Design a protein around this ligand. Structure first.
Ligand SMILES: Nc1ncnc2c1ncn2[C@@H]1O[C@H](COP(=O)(O)OP(=O)(O)O)[C@@H](O)[C@H]1O
Ligand SMILES: Nc1ncnc2c1ncn2[C@@H]1O[C@H](COP(=O)(O)OP(=O)(O)O)[C@@H](O)[C@H]1O
Ligand SMILES: [Cl-]
Ligand SMILES: [Cl-]
Ligand SMILES: [Cl-]
Ligand SMILES: [Cl-]
Ligand SMILES: [Mg+2]
Ligand SMILES: [Mg+2]
Ligand code: NA
Ligand code: NA
Lengths: 385, 388
């Protein structure tokens, strides 16, 4: 691995496609190595642009626009941070010699629920929720009938609905319809699990290494708290690691992957996988020597990971207000920080409804205690408009 | 404490005066809180400018120029990172309502070796090496005669330091101190040599909730640059207590909230004060791997008026500098795959050029002992192939 000096002729250039809070930490980790960072997004002043050398606002769904920006900056690495990108163009560009992290194929497959689900359940023979695909409401209705109630419907490309009864069918389809994949959906049976985790799995030159499992709680479409290490039996852990390694090696390329799994006793079920840092992994900003962001950069730059140290019970709790403002302020911050407690405020330019504006991070002697400390801190922040 | 959102109307704005690698981490820590950062220096593309919202290049020693940039950017906080700043203008700005970190007086006293030495040894009665000031070559010779050999001479306002073992060196020592001093002419300090067992940096944070201390950081200096640093450096209970007392006294005397790098010499249980940075110190870069909150995160937490609460130390750790010698404006770093790994990381600063010996990065490592951490970091730093 050879790195230049940012802003100098031989600089190593990283282009971030998606400049949200996760990309912000990836940018910081690149900056820490003197890597030049170009942050791209569809709106100005996105979080990662604040810490990048320069930025570009473009429609990332427009392949042509994507091509121009890439051609303009000549990046050594293209690091997609969100599903909403013209992956067909990423494939093309990769074909043309560009380095897409972890690989263009991984990006394509993971952005389409069918792609990844067929890979996992069919090709790799991994355990998953039952499922069916549908491209018509009629077909959708038959699928639901085949899966049974309750079941969840999701757009393969984006609108999700937890369907309890046939009364919702009409509305379910319709919402799926409004939420990129020509209206096709997947219909899944509901897995009853004790808890869900994100197994942050780094694929690098020295192989695949795992972070301790991160438990998380989802509510209304957003993760609320995450924690590490989630208590699991050794067998369950082994099973989760085997599933994670198989998926990551099948997707290919170096990077940090967020493997989402459901745990029922000693049984582990694969759900999905992010081919990049995952939001629930923000707990790693306080819980490990190497954050998931630093791991992603280490890996994609072709450097060895070696090991990941875990600093005991830790948690993250989101700061997720709901208001409309273009000039947000945060008061009472003195009651949200202290020993074993930190906060991040993302720099988002505006809000219009629910939006994650920051996160609280805490450590403690027990997982439950860390969760409470983080939650309490997040709740002390007064978000003003 | 109220924080705005960077780039929005109610943003909280911080102006860094000096944009080196220490300022770069202060900038990153402000950015992590959505604080707007304006980085200023005497040269373009300085490390902190890479991670700042906006940057400016001016003569920081020109009070008028400093006022113009402040008037243009309207920062809430002025965070000096080097000594070469118009300190009288910092005093005026503070008088006008700007928050100078930690305070303008602290900057004035520490920018001149005489100010801080007289404050510490005379006003505060803290133990220091013997010393004499001199503003002419003949006075310099008289000072040496009284201090005795060996002694060290340094410009009061900066390089230019010499370890003098005999009269033979008098002539050159004077020359160098003059060339190395502010304006290329000025007063020097002649100090008696303290034969210490080891030296440390006691990173001391003065905040709304009191004064906190990081675990002592030991360091090794060579030819004007710190080479390795480690934490914790073992100290007797009495030595630690005395070190904390000295540090507390100096930080409270200088005033204001922030992290200060208190440099001390240790002789068994006895501790001698040497100097103090009224901001993060280079030897404290080990805290980038050794603590939950680095010295940079602590400085920001403190100056923003937030409580520190406490600082977690993760076990034995060390830093080792990457200090190449070359002339280039396009430096590259190869073999990086052999400089990072388990319990081992590096930082490359993004400095635009080099023309001689200059720190371009640092290696950081953790281990079960400082001895092993130091070796791991030194080895890693040495693996980096610097070319240009
Ligand atoms: N089949 C399923 N059974 C039970 N819960 C599920 C199932 N599929 C998804 N969920 C719940 O919905 C959440 C979000 O769905 P997911 O498939 O991860 O898509 P995304 O993370 O992109 O919204 C999961 O974290 C889990 O809490
Ligand atoms: N009086 C002294 N006795 C012994 N060593 C000294 C003395 N003064 C300085 N040194 C050595 O020189 C180093 C640099 O001096 P210092 O006063 O910290 O200046 P600066 O850090 O501004 O270069 C110290 O860290 C120590 O190694
Ligand atoms: Cl592992
Ligand atoms: Cl913000
Ligand atoms: Cl100028
Ligand atoms: Cl004197
Ligand atoms: Mg998910
Ligand atoms: Mg010093
Ligand atoms: Na910026
Ligand atoms: Na102040």
């Amino acid at each position: 691995t050879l790195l230049g000096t940012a802003l100098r002729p031989a600089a190593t250039r990283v282009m971030l496609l998606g400049s949200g809070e996760l990309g912000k930490e990836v940018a910081i980790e690149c900056q820490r190595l003197g890597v030049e960072v170009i942050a791209v997004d569809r709106y100005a002043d996105a979080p990662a642009m604040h810490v990048a050398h320069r930025s570009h606002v473009i429609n990332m769904l427009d392949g042509d626009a994507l091509r121009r920006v890439v051609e303009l900056e000549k990046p050594h690495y293209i690091v997609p941070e969100i599903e909403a990108i013209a992956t067909d163009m990423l494939i093309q560009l990769e074909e043309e010699g560009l380095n897409v992290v972890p690989c263009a194929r991984a990006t394509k497959l993971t952005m389409n629920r069918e792609g990844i689900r067929r890979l996992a359940a069919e090709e790799l023979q991994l355990p998953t929720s039952t499922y069916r695909f549908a491209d018509s409401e009629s077909l959708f209705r038959e699928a639901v009938a085949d899966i049974g109630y309750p079941c969840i419907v999701k757009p393969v490309m984006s609108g999700q609905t937890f369907i309890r009864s046939a009364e919702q069918l009409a509305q379910a389809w319709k919402y799926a319809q409004q939420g990129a994949g020509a209206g096709r959906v997947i219909v899944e049976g509901v897995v009853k699990f004790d808890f869900e985790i994100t197994l942050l799995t780094v694929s690098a030159v020295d192989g695949v290494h795992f972070c301790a499992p991160v438990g998380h709680r989802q509510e209304d479409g957003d993760y609320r708290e995450s924690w590490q290490p989630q208590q699991m039996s050794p067998l369950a852990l082994e099973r989760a690691q085997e599933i994670a390694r198989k998926v990551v090696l099948a997707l290919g390329g170096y990077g940090l992957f967020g493997v989402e799994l459901f745990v029922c006793g000693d049984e582990v079920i694969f759900s999905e996988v992010s081919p990049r840092p995952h939001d629930t992994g923000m707990v790693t900003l306080i819980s490990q020597d190497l954050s998931e962001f630093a791991l992603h950069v280490r890996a994609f730059l072709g450097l060895p990971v070696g090991g990941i140290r875990q600093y005991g019970p830790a948690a993250s709790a989101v700061i997720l207000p709901q208001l409309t403002s273009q000039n947000v302020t945060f008061d009472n911050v003195q009651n949200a920080v202290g020993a074993d407690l930190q906060i991040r405020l993302f720099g988002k330019p505006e809000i219009d409804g629910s939006r994650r504006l920051g996160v609280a991070l805490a450590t403690a002697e027990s997982v439950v205690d860390a969760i409470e400390r983080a939650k309490h801190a997040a709740g002390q922040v007064k978000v003003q408009g």
